[PDB]
């Protein structure tokens, strides 16, 4: 029948999309390798999430539930596989979480047939997003995410003012999720991330204090907070680890991405930095390192951005944005960086621990002015010209 | 001569552009079919609107009047033809109206040789835009549009503050237009649209009360107002029909598009919804239905967006926008939806009354939260997996 | 060795990029001719600016200093060559100046091996940008640029508030630059430009008074100020030459681009105009002319924009922007216009003095309303239809 | 496993290829419509014909039996479906027959899982090829094909000398084939085709007498032979119906394609014509019509070719060739023409009975000289110019 042929073609086209081999982009900067195709798009969501496949109830074979974007994904190596914890945004503008897995880390990502069922905390949330996964030494996988609600303080007609809390959930199988109490804290928080080891016998969070839902106000950067009990999590002392600076890529706000990778040289961090421009907010990725002895102590601050939107990345629902809350480092040192572009699609970039540490240690630090930038550059030029002779 | 050859080539290239056959995009969602090419762009404006073709006064053969965009078009079936009432924006940043016609509804749109001459109301307007055409049962074609003027209240140096009124004009041939008094109302209005039938013997308008020129403030959504005399139009009672909601595609504002289509199941509406993001305002299209017995009563509210920017649509003068104020439904049920992308160009999408009603009735309603979205999705997945077994 | 082969390929690929022949775009408006490729991108910066080429210190051969954008360039004809004074933005978000030269004006631009060393004025600047070069009759090449600093008045957490001064430097070889005192003035200034001739025996500046760092506030447009001593430059009297207007392409702000070209008909100006839209600020180019007898007197005001973003130009770090602060007119009348798109890359457009003057004189003036625009257009249509008969 | 993933991808890629929607080529001559994609290529053969899918016996997953070409196909409408009787050539250079079916006639052709098992006649054949299917009024489907054998009457070392005979088989299900005795005839024969009706109570064959295996020699064209008993088929009298002509597209040889279609105007024929050129033999398609009352009598001979190689068709194993031995005419008059290009792939072209008859009746007959061609052309030009005036 025509209907059955149509269903068969939808399914076949979907498999062809899912199975497409990714290829590295030859042109690069020697630090990271980009790939020709996104690892996930809205079109990668299962056909059976979007269409009612029953001819009796959907004779025209149209989508019943539109999928809009696959973005800001957490990531974990899981039982031999490369997993993303995807933020999937429906056409209804709500996001939910969904696991996708790949055998190789760069292609053939496929969603688990059901998305994540995440129980509410005591106060229901309207939207949940941007989960960072941490395999903690306590044996649990934690997902720390943003739980967003309408601001009850808002005046008449204001249906946009919102509040953000840090949601905390844990699991041992990524299917059954236990919802713990939202993080208790004196300001708004987003980009909260669990450090994978106890520090002084306590849970350690990366935080991002902010005075408002979008603007950080007095918030100074990426913070560090020790928590006695993750099941009744409350911030007491909070220390800023990586600061915002005028006229850098992290001027207006910043935030930790995935939890950092442990290297022999220190903790290797991936974060985002924001500035304002005539087109709105511009988000790029950057890196820094902290000490193994004292994870609050910066030991590498390469100048500028690590990655910024290139080509197709520049455009989407929220253009001029890269964002990452997930990466995977294999035992052999290979690193798979999962980053969203423009709040619309997921990409992968690859590198190695050795290359990323090299980048952090030997990209000169920002001297914070045009004159300083020129002096650093002239020094490199001089070395190169002498060599090229 | 070289000049004459140049004119001949301008004219020939223009005809080739105008005559190009459109083709449907194979990949779609089963609800609407997109098309490979826009139905109108600035390049579709006549050569003789832009160039002075006289060698004596334009020896270099350069454009004398630049055309910037063809957007936000009304639409009507007219004497066997498919007509758009185009908003054409010049390089001078003023818009004017112009009729374009096609024999088939998807390609070969051609502007009438002269654009629309629209007389001023008592108070002159600086810009006019976004006309909705209504063939009213009273025998007139009405165009309801936005008439914009500088805000006299503005302080020194403020050359941007503006006010919007609903302009009302009528015609029986789309060439001779009678300008009626601007709509009298207690707030700013844009997206005002005439319902095609009398209701309780009165003219019925879709309205969109707004506290400011761009922000709606207390304005609750798309309104309904009965008007005794369209030639002295004044709003008295006003009822909100379709409301804004936090964390939907119509959070910050919304507005009726073209006048709705009458179906056996009810009035079928096409509207736009706006939210804010890091890149600015994002505009998408959505649908709803109201009762034939009581056109103020919602009877279908499919969740989320009906159409959102895809591909080339995402980029233009005002990126991240779809907007529609025109569609045509033929007697056989075929629907031609005319929508602008990014305030720059006009597109067509096709569907049928049956498919659009199916979409409105069977796309689940928004339960307004991530948890609710997940439950709806899990229900569909469960049905499909049982079927696919 | 593999490393040496990699270096050799980086260098070879760079030469292939630099040497690529540009080609004009056939489709145009008869006023300006666009070109297929940008004249500069970040990839055009020398390999030896970005990479450490020594295997001992960079064994992975990765970039040590990322380059982000090449934009807003000044321009001058210099000893037979076509020169841009490029604003180069590093990955660190600081800009610096750098000379690039071409033998023909449309391709084969190559950076001088060292960028510009620009001494600080008494108060150090954080960023410097957008230099206009003027070969003044006094025998010096002046560069007038923006010097930006953090606003000390800013409250806690505000790392974005900034102040702009007009920096002044001069040179006779484009390598050794003398920094003069920043322009003294009662308001913020950006887009300051030196007129190439003395007027009443005084230096003459194009100015752009603004109440704030981004918003002009009461600032009325492009100004004119006579300065007694360029080495102790201070504005006294200041006159607005070209004004902002509601509902034009220069509504919110405007600014002089390069210094104007002297023609037998008057001074030929290139400027930018800004308006706000749902996507942010939109920047286009426009032209005007002033009198040789009195350079403060407007003698041509063609309506609307001269150039606006087309195609690839629309997208970049700061999308929806064209900006020019450099052009070159050869003795034969050929004009090379150097314009940035989206704060990301540099383009060239070509025309002639005769064509640009024709465009300025015969593009109708803006009558400031939709009705006026329609009347101008109908007049041209009528002439053309009579001719085409 | 990696192996199972590879098999899954082979199968998925194959289904995507098989299900691809064909699209008509817009630009045409108004007689036939070509299509963007071939209906069959060697890649369309089943994955399980080429690969051993068992990891135990094919651990590298390589092809065990290469498929080289899908060409010269018969065709029949069968139980509601569109069927080709494909000549499939293996990498071993032998051809075999195989049924492929489509629901619509222009795409989604899929081979039946097993190819045709064709029993040998008394003398074994080395190759079999180019089957024409005839649903005869006697209730059988006949396949008339070429059976080729080596000719040992050849100099030593001559392994190219061959003899072609007409093989005859019949079936009622296209799976079980009965092999009848090869046609007995005084010359070599290829392109023998069964007429679908008895003529004076006898079977009627289109023949093509030829003195050699490749060259026709004295063979004058397409012949007609009445046969008493198709199960002991022997030609007696043989009349040429359509002749070769110097300096036409059928100079060196010609041959009937599929059996002709019955129309109210006569029998509608599709044939091939051959000439020699510097590159070898050139094959094109042409048409002719014969009388219903007397099928030996020509009643239409449009000049020149009907179709000749265009674009991709020009190149393959045997370039510069079109060949057809199959077409289908639906009850509504729509005609699907299945033609091979360059002995490599199968294409479809569509027309209607009305259009093909119009083409045959109104394309002027060949007057056989340049002067005559010019006079015919000048006559049409004269009519057109007077009309265009
Ligand atoms: O959009 C850029 C980045 O903004 C942050 O989150 C958004 C969130 O995605 C929206 O749904 C909501 O309306 O506003 C938030 C605040 O701007 C950031 O956490 C990222 O999620 C996002 O990529
Ligand atoms: O730009 C998006 C949508 O905004 C609305 O209108 C604009 C109008 O087009 C502008 O010329 C003016 O400056 O501001 C208005 C308010 O934002 C909307 O009605 C649509 O016309 C437009 O697509
Ligand atoms: O971005 C558009 C235009 O804005 C102006 O300058 C920018 C400057 O480039 C930024 O680095 C700074 O942060 O803000 C300035 C004010 O918006 C303008 O002078 C152009 O440089 C620029 O193309
Ligand atoms: O085909 C190559 C070249 O052959 C010569 O002429 C051809 C002629 O074009 C054919 O029509 C005829 O059948 O055979 C001739 C002899 O090969 C040569 O003079 C060129 O015309 C032609 O390009």
SS3 of chain C: CHHHHHHHHHHHHHHHHHHCCCCECCCCCCCCEEECCCCECHHHCCHHHHECCCCCCCCCCCECCCEEEEEEEEEEEECCEEEEEEEEEECCCCEEEEEEEECCCCCCCEECCCCCCCCCCCCCCCEEEEEEEEECCCCCEEEEEEEEEECCCCCCCCCCCEEEEEEEEEECCCCCCEEECCCECCCEECCCEECCCCECCEEEEEECEECCCCCCCCCCEEEEEEECCHHHCECCCCEEEEECCCCCCCCCEEEECCCCEEECCEEEEEEEEEEEECCEEEEEEEEEEECCCCCCCEEECECCCCECCCHHHHCCCCCCEEEEEEEEECCCCEEEEEEEECCCEEEEEEEEHHHHHHHHHHCCECCCCHHHHHHHHHHHHHHHHHHCC
| Residue A196 Cα to ligand 1 middle (Å) | 25
- Which among B13, B62, B131, B315 is the top mutation candidate for probing chain C, defined by the most C β-carbons within 10 Å of its own β-carbon? B62
Nearest to A46 by CA among A110, A129, A116: A110
Chain A interface includes C94 (CB < 8 A) = yes
Nearest to A54 by CA among A128, A3, A126, A109: A3
Cβ(B44)–Cβ(B17) below 8 Å: yes
Nearest to D266 by CA among D337, D357, D180, D348: D357
Nearest to B274 by CA among B298, B248, B300, B256: B248
Angle at D79 between CA D76 and CA D84, to 5 degrees: 30
Rounded to an integer, what distance in angstroms lies between the CA atom of residue A312 and that of residue B337?
28
Interface touch D13/A13, C-beta < 8 Å: no
Neighbours of A11 (CB within 10 A): 19
CA distances from A171 to A141, A142, A184, A286, C15 (A): 5, 7, 21, 30, 54
Max CA separation in chain C (angstroms): 77
| Residue D277 Cα to ligand 4 middle (Å) | 8
Pocket test for ligand 2, best of B128, B255, B284, B323 (most atoms within 8 A of CB): B323
Chain B interface includes C218 (CB < 8 A) = yes
CA distances from B63 to B14, B47, C377, C383, D76 (A): 14, 9, 12, 14, 60
Interface chains of chain A (3 or more CB pairs under 8 Å): B, C, D
With beta carbons under 8 A apart, name residues in chain A contacting D13.
Answer: 16, 19
Unique residue bearing structure tokens 């957007």 = B71
H-helix or E-strand spanning residue B95: strand B95-102
Pocket of ligand 2 (CB under 6 A): B 72, 129-130, 190, 214, 318, 321, 323, 343; C 277-278
Pocket test for ligand 1, best of A207, A254, A323, A338 (most atoms within 8 A of CB): A323
Buried (b) or exposed (e) across D253-280, using 16+ Cβ within 10 A?
Answer: bbbbbbbbbebebbbbbbbbbbbeeeee
Q: Minimal Cα–Cα distance from A329 to chain D, Å?
A: 22
Rounded to an integer, what distance in angstroms lies between the CA atom of residue B301 and that of residue B289?
7
3-state helix, strand, coil in chain D (%, to 5): 15, 40, 45
Interface touch B380/A65, C-beta < 8 Å: yes
Ramachandran quadrant class, D93 (left: phi over 0; alpha: psi -120 to 50; beta: rest)? left
Rounded to an integer, what distance in angstroms lies between the CA atom of residue B349 and that of residue B36?
10
Rounded to an integer, what distance in angstroms lies between the CA atom of residue A134 and that of residue A117?
18
| Pocket flag, ligand 4, residue D2 (CB < 6 Å) | no
| Residue B176 Cα to ligand 2 middle (Å) | 26
With beta carbons under 8 A apart, name residues in chain C contacting A274.
Answer: none
Nearest to C269 by CA among C359, C135, C145: C359
Superfamily of the domain at A1-389 = Glycosyl hydrolase domain; family 43 (2.115.10.20)
Nearest to B279 by CA among A285, D225, C279: C279
Rounded to an integer, what distance in angstroms lies between the CA atom of residue A61 and that of residue A106?
32
Tokens standing for A125? Answer: 């949330």
Unique residue bearing structure tokens 């540099």 = C346
Rounded to an integer, what distance in angstroms lies between the CA atom of residue B260 and that of residue C110?
59
With beta carbons under 8 A apart, name residues in chain C contacting B93.
Answer: 247-249, 251, 275, 304-305
Q: Minimal Cα–Cα distance from C113 to chain A, Å?
A: 8
Rounded to an integer, what distance in angstroms lies between the CA atom of residue B174 and that of residue B99?
8
Cβ(C166)–Cβ(C145) below 8 Å: yes
With beta carbons under 8 A apart, name residues in chain C contacting B96.
Answer: 370, 373-374, 377
Chain B interface includes C371 (CB < 8 A) = yes
Rounded to an integer, what distance in angstroms lies between the CA atom of residue B210 and that of residue B187?
6
Strand, coil or helix: D350: strand
Rounded to an integer, what distance in angstroms lies between the CA atom of residue A258 and that of residue A134?
8
| Residues in CB range of B389: below 8 A, 6 or more apart | none
Rounded to an integer, what distance in angstroms lies between the CA atom of residue B337 and that of residue B327?
4
Tokens standing for A254? Answer: 């910043």
Rounded to an integer, what distance in angstroms lies between the CA atom of residue C96 and that of residue C72?
11
Chain A interface includes B379 (CB < 8 A) = no
Cα A289–chain centre separation: 18
- Residue D94 backbone dihedrals phi, psi, to 5 degrees: -85, 145
Ligand 3 atom closest to the CA of C340, numbered from 1: 23
| Residue A244 Cα to ligand 2 middle (Å) | 36
With beta carbons under 8 A apart, name residues in chain D contacting A103.
Answer: 5
Of D5, D9, D16, the CB nearest to A13: D16
Domain assignments of chain B as residue spans, ordered by start: 1-389
Angle at A357 between CA A353 and CA A358, to 5 degrees: 115
- Nearest ligand by distance to the CA of A343: 1
Ligand 4 atom closest to the CA of D278, numbered from 1: 1
Cβ(B102)–Cβ(B78) below 8 Å: no
Nearest to B313 by CA among D151, D309, A315, D45: A315
Ligand 1 atom closest to the CA of A321, numbered from 1: 2
Of C114, C125, C279, the CB nearest to A279: C279
Pocket test for ligand 2, best of B73, B126, B130, B326 (most atoms within 8 A of CB): B130
Angle at A82 between CA A77 and CA A88, to 5 degrees: 110
CA-closest residue to ligand 2 atom 10: C277
| Residues in CB range of A12: below 8 A, 6 or more apart | D12, D15, D16, D19
First to last CA, chain D: 74
Interface touch B21/D26, C-beta < 8 Å: yes
Rounded to an integer, what distance in angstroms lies between the CA atom of residue D334 and that of residue B370?
53
With beta carbons under 8 A apart, name residues in chain B contacting C315.
Answer: 315
Burial class (CB in 10 A: 0-12, 13-18, 19+), A179: middle
Helices (H), D68-129: none
Burial class (CB in 10 A: 0-12, 13-18, 19+), D89: buried
| Residue B155 Cα to ligand 2 middle (Å) | 22
Rounded to an integer, what distance in angstroms lies between the CA atom of residue D358 and that of residue B242?
59
Specify the resolution in Å. 1.5
Unique residue bearing structure tokens 């990426």 = A222
Burial class (CB in 10 A: 0-12, 13-18, 19+), A182: middle
| Residues in CB range of D380: below 8 A, 6 or more apart | none
């Amino acid at each position: 029948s025509l209907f059955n042929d149509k269903v068969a073609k939808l399914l076949a086209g979907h498999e062809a999309l899912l199975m497409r081999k990714n290829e590295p982009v030859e042109e690069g900067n020697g630090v990271i390798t980009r790939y020709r195709y996104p690892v996930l798009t809205a079109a990668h969501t299962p056909v059976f999430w979007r269409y009612d496949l029953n001819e009796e109830t959907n004779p025209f074979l149209m989508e019943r539930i539109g999928m809009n974007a696959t973005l800001n994904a957490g990531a974990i190596k899981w039982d031999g596989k490369y997993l993303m914890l995807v933020r999937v945004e429906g056409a209804d503008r709500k996001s939910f979480f969904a696991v996708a897995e790949s055998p190789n880390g760069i292609d053939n990502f496929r969603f688990w047939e059901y998305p994540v069922t995440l129980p509410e905390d005591v106060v229901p949330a309207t939207n949940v997003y941007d989960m960072r996964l941490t395999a903690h030494e306590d044996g649990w996988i934690y997902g720390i995410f943003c739980a967003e609600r309408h601001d009850d303080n808002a005046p008449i007609g204001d249906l946009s003012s919102a509040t953000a809390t840090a949601g905390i959930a844990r699991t041992k199988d990524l299917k059954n999720w236990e919802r713990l109490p939202d993080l208790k804290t004196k300001s708004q928080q987003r980009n909260v991330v669990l450090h994978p080891e106890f520090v002084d016998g306590k849970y350690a969070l990366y935080t991002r204090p902010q005075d408002g839902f979008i603007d950080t106000g007095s918030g100074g950067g990426i913070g560090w907070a020790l928590i006695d009990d993750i099941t009744h999590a409350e911030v007491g002392e909070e220390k800023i680890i990586d600061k915002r600076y005028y006229h850098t890529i992290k001027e207006v706000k910043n935030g930790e991405g995935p939890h950092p990778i442990k290297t022999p040289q220190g903790w290797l961090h991936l974060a985002h930095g924001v500035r304002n421009c005539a087109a709105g907010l511009r988000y790029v990725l950057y890196m820094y390192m902290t000490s193994l002895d004292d994870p609050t102590r910066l030991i590498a601050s390469p100048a500028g951005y690590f990655m910024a939107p290139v080509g197709e990345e520049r455009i989407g629902d929220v253009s001029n944005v890269l964002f990452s809350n997930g990466w995977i480092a294999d035992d052999d040192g290979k690193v798979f960086i999962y980053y969203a572009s423009s709040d619309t699609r997921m990409h992968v970039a690859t590198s190695t621990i050795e290359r990323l540490v090299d980048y952090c240690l030997h990209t000169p630090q920002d001297g914070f002015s045009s004159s300083a930038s020129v002096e650093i550059l002239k020094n490199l030029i001089e070395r190169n010209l002498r060599l090229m002779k």
